[PDB]
Amino acid sequence: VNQNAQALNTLVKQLSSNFGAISSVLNDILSRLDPPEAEVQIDRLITGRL
Amino acid sequence: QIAPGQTGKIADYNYKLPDDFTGCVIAWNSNNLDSKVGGNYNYLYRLFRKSNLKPFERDISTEIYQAGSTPCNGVEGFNCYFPLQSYGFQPTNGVGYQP
Amino acid sequence: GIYQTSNFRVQPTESIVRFPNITNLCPFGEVFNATRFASVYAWNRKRISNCVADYSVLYNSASFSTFKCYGVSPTKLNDLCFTNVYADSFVIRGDEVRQIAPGQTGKIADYNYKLPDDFTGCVIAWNSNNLDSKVGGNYNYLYRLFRK
Amino acid sequence: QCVNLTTRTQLPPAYTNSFTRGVYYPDKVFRSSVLHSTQDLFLPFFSNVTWFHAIHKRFDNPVLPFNDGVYFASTEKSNIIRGWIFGTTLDSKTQSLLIVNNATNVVIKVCEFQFCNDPFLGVYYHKNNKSWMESEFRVYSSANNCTFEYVSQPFLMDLEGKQGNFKNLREFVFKNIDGYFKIYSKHTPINLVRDLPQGFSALEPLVDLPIGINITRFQTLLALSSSGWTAGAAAYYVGYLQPRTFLLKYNENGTITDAVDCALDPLSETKCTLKSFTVEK
Amino acid sequence: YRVVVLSFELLHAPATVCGPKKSTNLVKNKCVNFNFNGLTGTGVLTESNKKFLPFQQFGRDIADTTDAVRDPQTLEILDITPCSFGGVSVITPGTNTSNQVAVLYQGVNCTEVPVWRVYSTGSNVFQTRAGCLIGAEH
Ligand SMILES: *[C@@H]1O[C@H](CO)[C@@H](O)[C@H](O)[C@H]1NC(C)=O
Ligand SMILES: *[C@@H]1O[C@H](CO)[C@@H](O)[C@H](O)[C@H]1NC(C)=O
Numbered sequence: 001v002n003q004n005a006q007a008l009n010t011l012v013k014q015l016s017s018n019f020g021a022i023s024s025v026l027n028d029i030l031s032r033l034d035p036p037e038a039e040v041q042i043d044r045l046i047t048g049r050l
Numbered sequence: 051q052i053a054p055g056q057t058g059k060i061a062d063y064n065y066k067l068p069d070d071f072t073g074c075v076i077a078w079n080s081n082n083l084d085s086k087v088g089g090n091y092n093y094l095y096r097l098f099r100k101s102n103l104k105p106f107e108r109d110i111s112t113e114i115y116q117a118g119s120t121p122c123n124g125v126e127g128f129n130c131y132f133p134l135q136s137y138g139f140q141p142t143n144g145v146g147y148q149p
Numbered sequence: 150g151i152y153q154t155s156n157f158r159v160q161p162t163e164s165i166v167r168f169p170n171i172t173n174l175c176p177f178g179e180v181f182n183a184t185r186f187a188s189v190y191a192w193n194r195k196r197i198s199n200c201v202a203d204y205s206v207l208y209n210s211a212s213f214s215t216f217k218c219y220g221v222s223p224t225k226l227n228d229l230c231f232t233n234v235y236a237d238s239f240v241i242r243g244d245e246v247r248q249i250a251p252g253q254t255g256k257i258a259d260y261n262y263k264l265p266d267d268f269t270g271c272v273i274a275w276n277s278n279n280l281d282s283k284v285g286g287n288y289n290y291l292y293r294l295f296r297k
Numbered sequence: 298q299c300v301n302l303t304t305r306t307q308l309p310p311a312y313t314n315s316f317t318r319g320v321y322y323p324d325k326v327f328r329s330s331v332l333h334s335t336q337d338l339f340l341p342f343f344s345n346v347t348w349f350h351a352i353h354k355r356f357d358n359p360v361l362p363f364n365d366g367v368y369f370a371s372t373e374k375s376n377i378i379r380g381w382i383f384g385t386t387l388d389s390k391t392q393s394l395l396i397v398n399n400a401t402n403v404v405i406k407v408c409e410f411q412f413c414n415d416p417f418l419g420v421y422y423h424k425n426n427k428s429w430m431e432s433e434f435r436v437y438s439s440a441n442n443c444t445f446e447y448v449s450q451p452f453l454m455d456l457e458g459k460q461g462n463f464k465n466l467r468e469f470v471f472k473n474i475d476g477y478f479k480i481y482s483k484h485t486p487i488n489l490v491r492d493l494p495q496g497f498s499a500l501e502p503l504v505d506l507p508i509g510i511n512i513t514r515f516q517t518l519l520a521l522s523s524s525g526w527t528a529g530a531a532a533y534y535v536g537y538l539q540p541r542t543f544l545l546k547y548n549e550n551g552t553i554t555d556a557v558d559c560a561l562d563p564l565s566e567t568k569c570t571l572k573s574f575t576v577e578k
Numbered sequence: 579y580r581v582v583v584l585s586f587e588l589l590h591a592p593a594t595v596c597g598p599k600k601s602t603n604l605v606k607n608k609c610v611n612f613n614f615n616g617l618t619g620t621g622v623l624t625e626s627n628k629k630f631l632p633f634q635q636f637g638r639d640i641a642d643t644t645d646a647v648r649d650p651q652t653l654e655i656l657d658i659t660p661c662s663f664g665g666v667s668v669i670t671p672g673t674n675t676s677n678q679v680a681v682l683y684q685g686v687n688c689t690e691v692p693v694w695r696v697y698s699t700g701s702n703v704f705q706t707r708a709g710c711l712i713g714a715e716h
């Protein structure tokens with residue numbers, strides 16, 4: 001039980017990292033840049049989460 | 051502002067290039083060809099719009115634009131303008147302002 | 150057997166937004182509707198900061214002869230915001246209201262008050278003939294004609 | 298007007314051990330029954346803090362630095378400490394900032410002054426009226442340029458009081474980060490003679506201001522013809538903050554109850570790496 | 579002519595006069611998308627009993643996910659719950675026998691199943707500990 005809870009916990013916890021992008025919140029990247037630049041950030045985010 | 055994804059008056063209101071463009075652009079000055087000291091006001095551009103237009107779309111409507119909150123009718127009114135505007139094309143201008 | 154497909158979601162319906170009970174306005178009445186302003190040679194300067202600015206009520210008002218902004222579109226002033234505000238108030242001739250634009254020439258633009266080539270701000274002018282004008286001529290208002 | 302008071306006895310600087318003091322709420326979130334690990338500017342545990350006191354024959358109000366905020370503590374009665382100054386030069390070579398708790402109002406402002414060597418406020422004592430009347434206000438010599446000012450509501454604060462033991466334990470911590478001046482504070486009733494006690498109590502936030510200037514030094518303002526005086530018994534202590542990592546324990550109601558310093562000694566490091574207050578064999 | 583010139587500036591120092599904030603009404607008990615003082619999210623809001631301190635605004639969880647907020651205009655506590663989701667399952671005998679099927683919405687209390695539709699109110703809605711079963715008889 002302990003190992004299962006810990007693995008799930010860290011999975012959820014990996015959603016608040018940067019991976020090199022500007023911010024960890026997708027809405028803030030979308031609502032602060034233009035589509036020709038937000039793409040290069042969203043790509044980093046999706047790579048890390050994958 | 052012609053390159054894909056750029057911004058500004060032209061790229062935003064009259065001519066929009068798509069982001070997946072696969073083509074070339076050719077540009078050269080024609081000052082001594084079509085510029086007159088009196089001013090070639092045959093050339094007009096759109097200054098205002100309710101919103102930006104889709105890629106490779108062409109707008110020709112001449113209905114007056116409204117800037118202020120108040121509505122407008124007729125042909126002219128305060129803070130309600132004819133959106134078209136002409137260039138001051140003369141050879142005497144500095145670099146860039148030539149056609 | 151039994152197979153899996155097609156996740157689903159409840160798909161929220163409407164939107165909502167909230168903010169604090171904002172109440173501390175800027176005293177515009179003391180700079181726009183003051184009893185008397187200064188002359189062009191001594192344009193009065195008043196600073197505004199630390200308050201709430203509402204440009205809608207002044208942009209929709211039509212009693213103003215001219216409302217020309219250069220650094221911001223008129224509708225966007227109610228969506229952006231600032232570090233400092235300064236108001237330069239004065240009184241001029243009705244024919245010299247076109248000289249106050251940045252980079253122009255003329256006696257007022259060259260002797261009294263000039264605007265920089267990259268002025269970020271706005272100019273609001275209105276006629277108040279019946280407010281401070283008299284039959285005998287309110288000579289208290291005067292300008293500069295000679296300067297080095 | 299401002300004159301130097303030199304009638305004192307001389308003593309060396311004194312140091313004292315700050316066991317567990319100077320923990321504040323790093324942010325505005327709420328949590329319940331949790332252990333959270335934070336990194337921020339704190340006052341290291343069991344550090345040595347500088348100690349200044351005004352007794353009877355002593356009048357000590359020197360200029361001390363201000364780097365990465367400071368923890369200022371006071372064991373006092375009769376409200377003798379009143380003011381605070383800040384600025385890069387404090388001499389109109391650069392901007393300057395001022396906080397004061399007058400007997401009537403609390404004043405805050407940024408301007409360009411020129412402070413004397415020993416500015417102070419002076420309250421007369423029992424001049425046939427039983428009312429210690431504040432009459433001396435010698436902070437600066439001028440105020441050239443101002444970019445922001447403010448003053449709060451007037452009030453009444455007693456300028457009298459004599460106790461055998463200091464009752465007010467006032468703790469303050471100040472920081473200046475990226476143009477925001479932050480002030481956290483807390484008040485406690487204590488019965489101790491000449492020391493800062495043992496105990497745990499966190500400091501809530503009180504104020505944030507958008508000043509935006511460089512601050513490097515500071516100085517206190519103390520409550521006292523041009524020579525001769527009487528200062529009420531009072532003591533204040535100064536400590537400095539450093540970047541550390543702490544482990545904070547939130548109870549059921551979201552109020553901090555205990556903390557652990559993850560760099561003091563190896564046992565605490567073990568506690569910190571396991572994220573618990575008890576470690577098994 | 580009386581003239582006034584505004585000489586403000588942009589985007590170089592912490593602002594001091596900003597102004598432009600407007601607020602709508604508050605709703606409850608339906609999945610909506612909200613913005614509380616720049617906290618953007620989506621979910622359903624309910625009345626809670628958590629006891630914030632006077633200076634605290636948000637509330638967070640073990641995994642650092644917000645689950646409680648304080649209404650800026652009236653000082654009250656709202657609990658946030660994400661609205662439902664799950665997978666869909668098709669129970670079928672082979673196509674060699676029949677073209678009839680049953681549908682399982684797993685992990686959903688089918689008081690709100692509807693949000694092909696015919697298998698959303700078809701011939702029954704049977705509740706089981708694994709979810710809502712539609713098209714099969716008890
Ligand atoms: C702190 O100051 C006291 C003063 O006596 C001294 O004994 C002690 O060693 C000092 N500790 C540190 C870490 O500087
Ligand atoms: C938490 O606060 C409640 C009242 O809000 C109080 O009844 C309770 O005793 C507090 N917690 C503890 C551990 O005392």
Ligand SMILES: *[C@@H]1O[C@H](CO)[C@@H](O)[C@H](O)[C@H]1NC(C)=O
Pocket residue numbers: 716
């Ligand atoms: C099974 O029988 C019970 C009576 O013992 C009855 O209440 C219930 O409705 C029946 N279930 C079904 C699915 O018919």
